[PDB]
Each structure stands twice: as structure tokens, then as C-alpha cells.
Design a protein around this ligand. Structure first.
Ligand SMILES: Nc1ccn([C@@H]2O[C@H](COP(=O)(O)O)[C@@H](O)[C@H]2O)c(=O)n1
Ligand SMILES: Nc1ccn([C@@H]2O[C@H](COP(=O)(O)O)[C@@H](O)[C@H]2O)c(=O)n1
Lengths: 250, 249
């Protein structure tokens, strides 16, 4: 029952952020999330500008930017709007209660003011999502739950993954999908994003990740960022990921 | 076979940061960590100065400080040195590889430059600690592993906790203890810090330290939301300390 990204964006219970994301994916023929693992704002903004047309999402780590300012994120928003991609702050929230709300809304970074998407760990319980949602729902933001992990020694068991899915379903007004290695929910309203993606050779190809394992979006860092021609690199990954998606439809 | 903090500070295999902490705990008669959950630097520094003598450790969330600058952390270090407490940045690191290293060492906060201790989740595997250690070892820092959650719906099963302990042992050069609700390791070189503490899921200091074997209580609102924060801090210090004395025998 595979539906296109475009049709999934029209589902009755789709979250507005997921619908926005699915629509630009279909329009631009990209299911590539760029992991912009850089330490200087100038390089972040030049990557966002040049690769913006190739990507559906730019994943940031604002807490490694040596020259972070809110004006930097203002300029990033302008690029996200112009090129049509979402901003995903890969903050991996894990606290609960009023702390996690302030970590999302306040402090120096004011993440919720500029990030369309954030992610959260589910190990402490739904308290992480609940705290974030007290901020994010008012702001029409979305959250991704880290449901699986392939790093060596990961402790996310089958039960851990099931709990993450159930948490997503109970908080579907804020949770819009998962970080995982494969499809973990059969509900088409949720997005699946997968890191550990390589064309060349523990990582897997887009065909494996998007085609066989049913994920929606590939997260790619060094395979693009460390290349000389980052644009051609992004395009290689975009074409691979998109053609894996198309072959899944039939 | 229950040892004093002072005796544990001298154990052959003790980490230098743990030894420093255990020594000042014994000296000052405190096993209280203040959770300084405040959003302005003025309140942070006024609490650190006033409660410094009563605490072994000040737990910070630098990323909720609306007026963070490095000069604020310079003032905090000055107070930590003067009153003799460690700074524990409760960052709950969870990323791996070069990203965690930059999150610990770099960015705006430069955590490793001022935090004696940080904590880390173990769910992604040992990559979190390995990455932190590449920064933290050179800087003589220490790390705490979150071995038990203590929150509703926690997913940390028995096997998860055991894995956290095994990971701490394999990384004893950098990992100095655990965040947990009770003693998770019988090795006295490791420290146990327990959150969720109130005199009245909260547990009492006498339950946490006396019966559950933990070393340090982490207390936020029980102190910070009281009118007289200094008297509240002294109440928690004496409860936790007397609980620790009662188990030595
Ligand atoms: N097995 C993996 C591999 C990469 N990643 C993440 O994917 C992003 C991109 O990593 P690369 O530079 O390896 O492509 C990083 O945030 C990295 O931590 C992951 O979470 N799990
Ligand atoms: N049951 C609890 C209670 C508090 N805590 C921790 O204690 C801090 C808040 O403490 P207070 O409830 O004392 O204000 C947070 O860092 C939180 O993570 C916990 O981990 N589990």
C-alpha cells in the first residue's frame, strides 16, 4: 500500500510539518537530509545555499558552531525558505520537565524559534516528549523519536523500539516520525530518517535503506561534507535515494 | 565493609577527580549536589556563593542560562575553588564520534574548559564515552554514566543498567561514577549520584543514602524553591550526611 510522498502529505491525520516536508520532497525529487557537521557559520550558510536545492532537510548541531548567533539562524531560515528545506536541530533531547522545555525554548540557542524539527531520546520515558511538546505544539514544530540505533553496542532493543513507536502514536500532534535504521511504524503519517548511509564501502546504500528497509529519508554527512565537490556529492546521494524511493512504488 | 569517603579517596584505583570529590566531601561533611536550575547568571552565582560551603557539587544546565557568557563560568569556577565544590554540567551527552567531542570541547559553551564532571547516556553504545574521553582525558576531567532513569516509563531494564556498569569499568580512566537511584556497582572507586530527592517519584535522603547505598543526593526544587535557600541546603546536607554516617558502622 505504498503511497507517494505527495499523497502522504494529503493524509487526514498528517502533521502540518510532515505534510510540508513530504510536499517539498515530492516537488524537488529529494529525500536527502544533509548532516551539516561544521563548526563555522560561514561554511554552514554556504553549504545550505549551494546544496539547498538538492536536499529536503538540513540537520544542524548548533552547539558546535563556534560563532553561533541568532542572526546566523535568521540567515539559515532565509535559505531554508528560498530553497525549500526544513531545519532539523539534532539536539537529541533527553531531559524532562521544565529543564527540557527551557533547553528547547530558551537559553542562548532558542532552538524552537528556528528549528522546524528536533529529535529526542525515549529512554527516560515520555517525559522528554511531554516537556518538549509544552513548547513545540504552540509553535507548530515537530519532533522525531530516536527509535533504533546501529552504532556499536547500541542498547535499543526490540522492546525499546516498540515503546518509541507507541510514544509517537500517543503524541502524534507533535511527533512526526523516527530516527531508525528501517521502517518501524506501518502508519504512513510518520516519517523515517536513517543515518549510516554510503554509496561506496557497517553503513548501507540508499537502495538498502530506502528500498529494502522502507525508510523515507537518508541522513548523510561526511560522504558529502568531506568531498571536494560537495554539490556533485549531494546529487549522487539524492539520485540514489530518489530512485530507491521510486522503485519502492512500482 | 562499607568505607568512609575519606578512605575511598585513597583507594589505589581511584580516579583523581573522584578522589578530589571524596576528599572535599569528607572535609566539609557534605554529600549534597545542588541542582542550580535557574536561568539568569546573577541567581546562579549568588546561589553558588551562598550555598558553596554546604555542597560538594553544583549541577548546571548552561544551555538554559539566558545570559550565558564564558566570563560567567569564570566567576563560577572562582567560587567553586573558593568554597571547594566541583562543577557538574548535566548535559546528558548522547552523540558519538567527532560531534560529541565538539559538543564537549567547543561551540559557544566550551563545557570541558569549566566542568569538572559531565554525564552521558549509554544507549548509543560506548561511542558516547569514547568521544568524550578524547577530550576529557587530556583535560583531567571525569564523566558519569546514566545507569538508571528514575522517571515514569523509563526504558532502562536490568540489562541496560548492567551494560552501563560494564561500560564504566572498561572506561575507568574517565568514568568516575553513575547517575542512578541506588548502588549499581559494588566497586567503591565509583560514585553514585541520585536525583529525585525530597525530605517529604521522590525519595528521602535517609532512604537514598542510608538504605539504597547511594553517595550523593541531587536536590533542586527542595532547595531552590524554598524562601531561605541556605537553610534548606543545610537541612538536606545534614540529612544526607547523617544517612551516610549511619551506614558506616
Ligand atoms: N550508524 C550511524 C551512523 C551515523 N550516524 C549519524 O549520522 C550523521 C552523519 O554521519 P556521517 O558523517 O558518517 O555520514 C551524524 O550525525 C552521525 O552521528 C548515526 O547516528 N548512526
Ligand atoms: N524522579 C526524578 C526527579 C528528579 N530528577 C532530576 O533532578 C533534577 C530536578 O530535581 P528536582 O525535582 O529536585 O528539582 C533534574 O536534573 C532531573 O533529571 C530525576 O532524574 N528523576
Amino acid at each position: 500500500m505504498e503511497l507517494s510522498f505527495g499523497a502522504r502529505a494529503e493524509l487526514p491525520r498528517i502533521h502540518p510539518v510532515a505534510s510540508k516536508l513530504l510536499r517539498l520532497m515530492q516537488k524537488k525529487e529529494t529525500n536527502l537530509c544533509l548532516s551539516a557537521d561544521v563548526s563555522l557559520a560561514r561554511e554552514l550558510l554556504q553549504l545550505a545555499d549551494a546544496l539547498g536545492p538538492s536536499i529536503c532537510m538540513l540537520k544542524t548541531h548548533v552547539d558546535i558552531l563556534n560563532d553561533f548567533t541568532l542572526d546566523v539562524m535568521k540567515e539559515l531560515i532565509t535559505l531554508a525558505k528560498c530553497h525549500e528545506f526544513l531545519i532539523f536541530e539534532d539536539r537529541k533531547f533527553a531531559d524532562i520537565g521544565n529543564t527540557v522545555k527551557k533547553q528547547y525554548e530558551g537559553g542562548i540557542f532558542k532552538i524552537a524559534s528556528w528549528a522546524d524539527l528536533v529529535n529526542a531520546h525515549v529512554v527516560p520515558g515520555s517525559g522528554v516528549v511531554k516537556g518538549l511538546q509544552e513548547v513545540g505544539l504552540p509553535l507548530h514544530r515537530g519532533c522525531l523519536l530516536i527509535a533504533e540505533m546501529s552504532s556499536t553496542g547500541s542498547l535499543a532493543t526490540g522492546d525499546y523500539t516498540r515503546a518509541a513507536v507507541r510514544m509517537a502514536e500517543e503524541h502524534s500532534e507533535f511527533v512526526v516520525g523516527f530516527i531508525s535504521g528501517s521502517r518501524v511504524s506501518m502508519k504512513p503519517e510518520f516519517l523515517h530518517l536513517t543515518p549510516g548511509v554510503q554509496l561506496e564501502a557497517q553503513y548501507n546504500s540508499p537502495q538498502e535503506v530506502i528500498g529494502k528497509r522502507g525508510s523515507d529519508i537518508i541522513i548523510v554527512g561526511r560522504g558529502i561534507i568531506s568531498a571536494a565537490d560537495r554539490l556533485e556529492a549531494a546529487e549522487m546521494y539524492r539520485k540514489a535515494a530518489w530512485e530507491a524511493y521510486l522503485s519502492r512504488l512500482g
